[PDB]
Amino acid sequence: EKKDLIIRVAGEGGEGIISSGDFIAAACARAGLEVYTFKTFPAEIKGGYAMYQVRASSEKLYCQGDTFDVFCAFNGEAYEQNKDKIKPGTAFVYDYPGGDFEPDEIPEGVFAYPIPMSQTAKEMKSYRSKNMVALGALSELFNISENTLKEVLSDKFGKKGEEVLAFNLEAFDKGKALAKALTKADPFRVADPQEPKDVIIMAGNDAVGLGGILGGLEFFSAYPITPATEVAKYVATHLPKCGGDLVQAEDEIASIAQVLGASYAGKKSMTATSGPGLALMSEMLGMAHMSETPCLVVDVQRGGPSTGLPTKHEQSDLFLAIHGGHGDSPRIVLSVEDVKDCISMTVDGLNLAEKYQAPVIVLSDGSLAFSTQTIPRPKPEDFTIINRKTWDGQGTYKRYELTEDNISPMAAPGTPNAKHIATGLEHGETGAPNYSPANHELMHRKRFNKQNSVLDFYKNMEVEGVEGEADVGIITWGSTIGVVREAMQRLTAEGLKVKAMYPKLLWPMPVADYDAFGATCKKVIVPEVNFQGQLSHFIRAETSIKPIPYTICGGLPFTPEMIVNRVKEEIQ
């Protein structure tokens, strides 16, 4: 039984394409439904074709889905951009008559629903209310709660006066009436309303900023870069409320430099960037490793290489995150799946930087950055918070004291009797420069054993599927995890012998857990969106698995059917 509905709305940005999608998402959440959205702004700032896709369901949602069930075109350009996906079985709502285009032969089997959105909006002497007419029609045709939709519109337009709101509700009613006059022949309906859940709706980048704040963030420095700037925007607004400071630095080098200085001063500090910025930070992340100074970098991955494809989907910064430092210079690397992770794994990221006095990189991506989801409302008291090991004041303080757990107690400036230097030169226990062979061997083992002990403490590699032997195991990372989750639902509903594993700690990697998983699968497929198969590379280098890479690199995420089809090709 189909529990979800995927509605794509597209047209001229500025006619309310995005705002319409956000209204539907909020209305469905207020009606007790789960929501997953995605959008593309116009390619140029001045405007042009925009797209919003909202998926709503009575059950949990983990990705955008294969393709839309319903498409709503505000103009001809939107129809042309999506014509190839208007296939038999889909429902097609479009601005007609009185729009700017005559639709070609609507394919047989397509449920077509012309709605005169532009003409109705013009007869009311308010062309900008066109999206309200569309919303009314979509609500009527596909059972988007009229009650919560008008609640959402009331919250937005009530502050503008009783006339403005009653006008937009009137345009909504006109669209509802236009749709009611058509005969509904398609099988698509949004799930019936339920009791509203204790949820919020958040975008990926906002959720990263909130996770930092909830993790005890005190200092943030960043430089704007697509698709990461909304993290700094959120932090700039809300961190000062909690007693913290955001600074916009002059570039990414200055930003990570300020993070290290604030961290040395004793404050939990982080930055956010994308691929180009992470590459500029490579030298300073070496200093963080060598001096054992906590820091957190969130890399919202975008299309590369070089300037690349800033607005497209790609997870191709794994090589740089792990191997981007000169010398033997390891980082702790995490990667998020969904909006929930953007909160809790940014908390994880700060906690692990504190606990292991090391640079941590959290890999997100540009689709998740702008996707919104219903997620359970975060409760601040439910997050475990870890603070850097601090000196108890007993004995003599040595910044790099050799301990059993390889973690040297820290001391913020101002601590009596703990004056010390943090340094990027190789050094002995007191931080004095030391170039002797035995010390370099000894301190490499200290810092490597320290960071590698994350494996004994942080486990985040969920396994699902059949319990026994599997014909195919699937390993993936990043937001591709969510796509494989939906594919696994379909594969196990077909009775296929499949299992899946979802590493979210990417480096150091839990080799034994990899080997235990692979030993139970006849074959292991690794789907990821990068050209070289970057996770597969590390699986080959570090485990006894030789995976079958399934790589794509066209600026788009995987869809569930692609995973399903690839898996079935490997089952005999």
Partner: protein
């Protein structure tokens, strides 16, 4: 607001020396600057638990190792950017950056404008020897064109820059210059730089006898000219005239000092206008995301 000053009784310069032997070349001008730092710290009665010395890479940049305080030895050119993060995180600390002409104005030249423009409450002591000492004698942005050095065996193909004029143009609110041969001039100007609330920059000529054979002690002694007592240290235009060296003479003394909000003060104003504090109910932020 720095809380390190006038906290200790009967402090002497040697109380701020670390155990690390100072291994600069004999006759290196950096010794005179280091002695000035010790003297400034003792005259201020500084509690060096609340003192942070931060440097990049260079002979000059070794200075924090020789100071008994909190300190960081960071990356070439990045000390001032690191120190900004330290200072903003902990405005109670006395934050001092030390470094050379290459560390500061070559690789570090991109961070210099923004520290000064933002008036970060810190002190920058630049030890200007007209060369890259630590990498063994390449020319610097302050080298004279007639000098030959190891990547310029046929002379430097450009003119040097003017550090004082840069920093005045950038908006430094305390700008001074001295010669390492006058350790009491160094001490007074560095002490005033530490006490100043805002970005304070002290350019100090320092001989490198090992590699710089023309910017000698005698050259610097003849180059400098004390600033007349009637000079108005609040007059930015007049300070810039001095920095441009009338008669070819480099001014020594205090060129410019003005009172303006610091970066940590403006950041604090933002929090105060929001009623921000560490105990803020984070549920209020979360509630903004409800559908």
């Amino acid at each position: 607001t720095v809380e390190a000053f006038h906290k200790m009784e009967n402090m002497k310069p040697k109380d701020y020396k670390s155990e690390v032997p100072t291994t600069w070349c004999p006759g290196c001008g950096h010794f005179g600057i280091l002695n000035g730092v010790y003297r400034a710290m003792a005259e201020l009665g500084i509690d060096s638990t609340k003192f942070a010395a931060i440097s990049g890479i260079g002979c000059s940049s070794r200075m924090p190792y020789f100071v008994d305080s909190y300190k960081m030895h960071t990356l070439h050119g990045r000390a001032g950017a690191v120190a900004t993060g330290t200072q903003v995180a902990r405005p109670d600390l006395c934050v001092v950056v030390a470094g050379g002409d290459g560390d500061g104005f070559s690789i570090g030249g991109g961070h210099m404008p923004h520290m000064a423009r933002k008036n970060v409450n810190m002190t920058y002591v630049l030890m200007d020897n007209g060369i890259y000492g630590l990498t063994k004698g390449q020319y610097s942005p302050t080298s004279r064109p007639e000098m030959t050095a190891y990547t310029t065996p046929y002379g430097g193909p450009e003119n040097p820059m003017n550090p004082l004029l840069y920093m005045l143009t950038y908006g430094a609110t305390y700008v001074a210059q001295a010669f390492a041969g006058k350790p009491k001039d160094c001490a007074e100007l560095i002490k005033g730089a530490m006490e100043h609330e805002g970005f304070a920059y002290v350019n100090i000529f320092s001989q490198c006898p090992t590699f710089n054979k023309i910017d000698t002690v005698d050259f610097y002694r003849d180059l400098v000219e004390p600033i007349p007592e009637d000079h108005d240290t609040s007059d930015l235009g007049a300070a810039m005239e001095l920095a441009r060296r009338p008669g070819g003479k480099a001014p020594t003394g205090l060129l410019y000092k003005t009172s303006a909000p610091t970066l940590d003060q403006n950041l604090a104003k933002i929090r105060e206008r929001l009623g921000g504090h560490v105990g803020y109910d984070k549920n209020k932020i979360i509630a903004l995301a409800k559908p």
